[PDB]
Amino acid sequence: EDSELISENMHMKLYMEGTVNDHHFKCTSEGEGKPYEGTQTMKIKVVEGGPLPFAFDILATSFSKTFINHTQGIPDFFKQSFPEGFTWERITTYEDGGVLTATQDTSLQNGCLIYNVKINGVNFPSNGPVMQKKTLGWEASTEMLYPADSGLRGHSQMALKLVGGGYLHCSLKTTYRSKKPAKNLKMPGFYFVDRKLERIKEADKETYVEQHEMAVARYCDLP
Amino acid sequence: EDSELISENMHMKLYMEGTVNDHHFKCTSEGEGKPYEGTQTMKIKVVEGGPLPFAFDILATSFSKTFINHTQGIPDFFKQSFPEGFTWERITTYEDGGVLTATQDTSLQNGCLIYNVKINGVNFPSNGPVMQKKTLGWEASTEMLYPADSGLRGHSQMALKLVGGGYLHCSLKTTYRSKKPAKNLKMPGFYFVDRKLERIKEADKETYVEQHEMAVARYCDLP
């Protein structure tokens, strides 16, 4: 039931705008991935408001759900949604008071996936590791997903590596909404997505960033 | 040491844009108030995305800190900030899972206060009173304000009255940031702002709302 419109190799283009604390910025990105293998790479440019006065890491999860390897016959909410596409909306709450919300539209245009993202980041502590750029990327994580009243609810927790060897914890809560009529969708049951979000390259005081994700959907895997 | 640029009667103009869940909208408003008496009225129009599929009440606090009567000699962070102006950034968390963040710029242009607001609301329950438009306005509230590492931190709790006679609780956490050099500012200590938010009139499924606020700053009122 995955859309035939999602091929083995797919390109993406993204536009992102928002504010973190009081700081306005815009990014664009281009990427390529293998939707059925759950892998993708994005090459990202900060085009307004750079270099950013906050850790780029807080933007990482806002740059792609079509590129999850849905194993074990798990119905794929995201690949099913095409050609109509889907949205997502999310809050990430950091233990030390910062919050980042994002709202995103995913469409498919002329064979290319198009992402449009709006970011609102608020109350990050002025002397904390995000605003002081003391962060070193994300540990691997697992999202749990299950049907919401409409759409799909996701929850995860993530750990941000800090200089000096410690961690900053956060929680993520998401709702994914399909633009495909509900009667044309086979909804999954409860399941997990295991993912690794890895930094490949950064240049020019983090105004150019390459990042990669691997994401695989499964049920529980312990006897 | 308030700015002489803030007179006894001031006008405001506002532009607001955002998304709640997946729903894009834009609002504009025109207003007037008495900054030193802590009273103001705004005439608000939904200009894109109307009628909104959520309760207007969730936008009420995003439509004005210059209009607080700062009593008891409390240094007035907002009135001192002109001509440069100030920004605010906020998360409101609802007990039933919705979150609304907002970021705001306050400027003074040709004697008129100009507000620019961006809204990101996420995860409002589909059958909850906000998305079902079963709300009846806000009870009176009190914000506590005190210096942050830079800026002014605010916290509040608010109760949204519901059709049927119950309440939906939320919490608000804000940072106000002055665009005036910190050496030219006298910071307050800890204080409270008591407020009431009311409507004068509304029409056409809340696509027109006239909102009024009275806000007075004080210290504890108990002997």
Short mmCIF file of C-alpha atoms in Angstrom, two decimals, chain A residues 1-207:
data_model
loop_
_atom_site.label_atom_id
_atom_site.label_comp_id
_atom_site.label_asym_id
_atom_site.label_seq_id
_atom_site.Cartn_x
_atom_site.Cartn_y
_atom_site.Cartn_z
CA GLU A 1 0.00 0.00 0.00
CA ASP A 2 2.97 2.30 -0.21
CA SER A 3 2.56 4.85 -2.99
CA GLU A 4 4.27 3.80 -6.24
CA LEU A 5 5.30 7.47 -6.29
CA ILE A 6 7.96 6.78 -3.66
CA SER A 7 10.82 5.21 -5.61
CA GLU A 8 13.96 3.40 -4.37
CA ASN A 9 15.95 6.65 -4.68
CA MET A 10 14.34 10.01 -3.88
CA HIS A 11 15.42 13.66 -3.71
CA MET A 12 14.21 16.27 -1.21
CA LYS A 13 14.23 20.04 -0.99
CA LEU A 14 13.56 22.00 2.20
CA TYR A 15 12.76 25.52 3.35
CA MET A 16 12.97 26.42 7.04
CA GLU A 17 12.29 29.66 8.89
CA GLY A 18 11.95 30.60 12.51
CA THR A 19 13.19 32.22 15.65
CA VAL A 20 15.11 30.85 18.63
CA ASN A 21 14.80 33.07 21.61
CA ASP A 22 14.84 36.38 19.76
CA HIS A 23 17.01 35.29 16.86
CA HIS A 24 15.52 35.02 13.39
CA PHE A 25 16.97 32.63 10.81
CA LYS A 26 16.31 30.81 7.53
CA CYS A 27 17.75 27.60 6.15
CA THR A 28 17.43 25.69 2.93
CA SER A 29 18.52 22.18 2.20
CA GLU A 30 18.83 19.59 -0.54
CA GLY A 31 19.02 15.87 0.02
CA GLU A 32 18.85 12.36 -1.31
CA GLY A 33 17.91 9.05 0.27
CA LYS A 34 16.64 5.50 -0.07
CA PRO A 35 13.12 5.51 1.46
CA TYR A 36 12.83 1.71 1.77
CA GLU A 37 16.29 1.32 3.25
CA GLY A 38 15.61 4.06 5.82
CA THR A 39 18.64 6.17 4.91
CA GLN A 40 19.06 9.80 3.86
CA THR A 41 21.55 12.65 3.70
CA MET A 42 20.83 16.38 3.73
CA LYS A 43 23.09 19.24 2.82
CA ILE A 44 21.98 22.30 4.70
CA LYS A 45 22.65 26.02 4.32
CA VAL A 46 21.94 28.77 6.79
CA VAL A 47 20.79 31.55 4.43
CA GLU A 48 19.62 34.26 6.88
CA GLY A 49 20.67 34.94 10.48
CA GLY A 50 23.98 33.05 10.26
CA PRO A 51 26.20 32.18 11.93
CA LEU A 52 23.54 31.12 14.41
CA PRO A 53 24.00 32.18 18.06
CA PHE A 54 22.68 28.80 19.24
CA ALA A 55 23.62 25.16 18.82
CA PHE A 56 22.73 23.83 15.35
CA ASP A 57 21.92 20.49 17.04
CA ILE A 58 18.55 21.88 18.22
CA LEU A 59 17.44 22.07 14.56
CA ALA A 60 18.55 18.54 13.60
CA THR A 61 15.19 16.79 14.04
CA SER A 62 13.36 19.40 11.97
CA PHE A 63 15.18 18.66 8.75
CA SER A 64 11.89 13.44 7.01
CA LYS A 65 9.58 10.53 7.78
CA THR A 66 9.23 9.06 4.27
CA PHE A 67 12.75 7.62 4.77
CA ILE A 68 11.94 5.04 7.42
CA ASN A 69 12.42 1.33 6.68
CA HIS A 70 9.07 -0.06 7.78
CA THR A 71 9.89 -3.74 8.53
CA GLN A 72 7.70 -6.64 9.74
CA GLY A 73 4.71 -5.61 7.57
CA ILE A 74 4.06 -2.50 9.64
CA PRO A 75 1.66 -0.27 7.64
CA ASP A 76 3.61 2.83 6.54
CA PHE A 77 1.54 5.95 7.33
CA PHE A 78 4.04 8.16 5.55
CA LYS A 79 4.58 6.30 2.25
CA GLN A 80 0.83 5.62 2.02
CA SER A 81 0.05 9.33 2.25
CA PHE A 82 1.26 10.20 -1.24
CA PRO A 83 0.50 11.80 -3.61
CA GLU A 84 -1.36 14.02 -1.09
CA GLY A 85 1.41 14.10 1.52
CA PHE A 86 1.37 14.77 5.23
CA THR A 87 2.16 17.24 8.01
CA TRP A 88 3.94 17.04 11.32
CA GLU A 89 3.87 19.17 14.44
CA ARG A 90 6.14 18.78 17.46
CA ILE A 91 7.31 20.06 20.82
CA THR A 92 10.82 19.32 22.08
CA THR A 93 11.23 20.22 25.78
CA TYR A 94 14.76 20.49 27.19
CA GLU A 95 15.39 19.74 30.88
CA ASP A 96 16.96 23.17 31.45
CA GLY A 97 14.04 25.26 30.24
CA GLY A 98 14.35 25.63 26.48
CA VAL A 99 11.46 24.58 24.26
CA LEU A 100 11.49 24.19 20.48
CA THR A 101 8.23 23.73 18.57
CA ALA A 102 8.09 23.06 14.85
CA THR A 103 5.36 22.65 12.27
CA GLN A 104 6.08 21.03 8.93
CA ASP A 105 4.43 20.33 5.57
CA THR A 106 5.56 17.45 3.35
CA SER A 107 4.48 17.46 -0.29
CA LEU A 108 5.53 15.67 -3.46
CA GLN A 109 6.14 17.87 -6.50
CA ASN A 110 7.42 16.70 -9.85
CA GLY A 111 8.96 13.56 -8.22
CA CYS A 112 10.71 15.63 -5.53
CA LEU A 113 9.78 15.68 -1.84
CA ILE A 114 9.32 19.23 -0.61
CA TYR A 115 9.54 20.18 3.08
CA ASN A 116 8.45 23.48 4.54
CA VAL A 117 9.19 24.00 8.23
CA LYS A 118 8.43 26.73 10.77
CA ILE A 119 10.43 26.86 14.04
CA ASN A 120 9.64 28.69 17.33
CA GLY A 121 12.33 28.20 20.03
CA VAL A 122 11.76 29.92 23.38
CA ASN A 123 13.38 30.40 26.80
CA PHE A 124 16.70 28.64 26.11
CA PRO A 125 18.89 29.62 29.11
CA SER A 126 21.22 32.40 27.99
CA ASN A 127 24.26 30.81 29.65
CA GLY A 128 23.21 27.20 29.04
CA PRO A 129 24.87 24.80 26.57
CA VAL A 130 22.52 25.49 23.68
CA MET A 131 23.00 29.27 23.64
CA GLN A 132 26.71 28.87 24.44
CA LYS A 133 27.14 26.25 21.67
CA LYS A 134 28.60 23.53 23.91
CA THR A 135 26.85 20.60 22.20
CA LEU A 136 28.24 17.63 20.24
CA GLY A 137 25.28 15.85 18.69
CA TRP A 138 22.59 13.33 19.50
CA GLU A 139 22.70 9.82 20.88
CA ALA A 140 20.61 7.19 19.10
CA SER A 141 16.92 7.22 19.96
CA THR A 142 13.65 5.34 19.69
CA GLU A 143 10.27 6.87 18.88
CA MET A 144 7.02 5.10 19.85
CA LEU A 145 4.13 5.65 17.45
CA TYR A 146 0.46 4.81 17.67
CA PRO A 147 -2.84 6.09 16.34
CA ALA A 148 -4.12 9.39 17.73
CA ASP A 149 -7.70 10.53 17.60
CA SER A 150 -6.84 11.40 14.08
CA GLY A 151 -3.36 10.93 12.68
CA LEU A 152 -0.43 9.31 14.39
CA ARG A 153 1.06 10.27 17.75
CA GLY A 154 4.84 9.96 18.31
CA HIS A 155 6.85 10.26 21.54
CA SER A 156 10.58 10.03 22.05
CA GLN A 157 13.33 11.08 24.38
CA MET A 158 16.73 12.18 23.29
CA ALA A 159 20.13 12.92 24.84
CA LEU A 160 22.30 15.76 23.59
CA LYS A 161 26.04 15.24 24.10
CA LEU A 162 27.86 18.11 25.80
CA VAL A 163 31.48 19.19 25.87
CA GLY A 164 33.09 17.74 28.99
CA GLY A 165 31.21 14.48 28.60
CA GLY A 166 27.75 15.13 30.09
CA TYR A 167 24.25 15.11 28.59
CA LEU A 168 21.24 17.36 28.19
CA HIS A 169 17.94 15.43 28.13
CA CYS A 170 14.85 16.32 26.16
CA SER A 171 11.44 14.90 25.32
CA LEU A 172 9.68 15.05 21.96
CA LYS A 173 5.94 14.78 21.34
CA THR A 174 4.67 14.78 17.75
CA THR A 175 1.46 14.42 15.75
CA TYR A 176 1.65 13.30 12.14
CA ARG A 177 -1.43 14.06 10.01
CA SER A 178 -2.15 12.60 6.57
CA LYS A 179 -3.66 14.66 3.75
CA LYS A 180 -4.95 11.38 2.26
CA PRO A 181 -8.59 10.59 3.01
CA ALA A 182 -8.72 8.31 6.09
CA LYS A 183 -10.70 5.61 4.23
CA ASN A 184 -7.72 5.25 1.86
CA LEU A 185 -5.26 4.57 4.72
CA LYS A 186 -4.33 1.38 6.54
CA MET A 187 -3.33 2.54 10.04
CA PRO A 188 -0.50 0.81 11.93
CA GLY A 189 -0.78 -0.45 15.49
CA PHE A 190 1.74 0.51 18.18
CA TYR A 191 5.34 0.35 16.94
CA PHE A 192 8.88 1.70 17.34
CA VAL A 193 11.30 3.59 15.14
CA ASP A 194 14.98 3.26 16.04
CA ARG A 195 17.07 6.05 14.58
CA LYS A 196 20.58 7.46 14.44
CA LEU A 197 21.05 11.10 13.48
CA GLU A 198 24.66 11.69 12.59
CA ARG A 199 26.68 14.75 11.72
CA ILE A 200 28.79 14.32 8.56
CA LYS A 201 30.36 17.77 8.06
CA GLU A 202 30.10 21.40 9.13
CA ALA A 203 31.74 24.44 7.62
CA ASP A 204 31.88 28.22 7.96
CA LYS A 205 30.94 28.44 11.65
CA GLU A 206 28.06 25.88 11.19
CA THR A 207 26.42 27.79 8.31
#
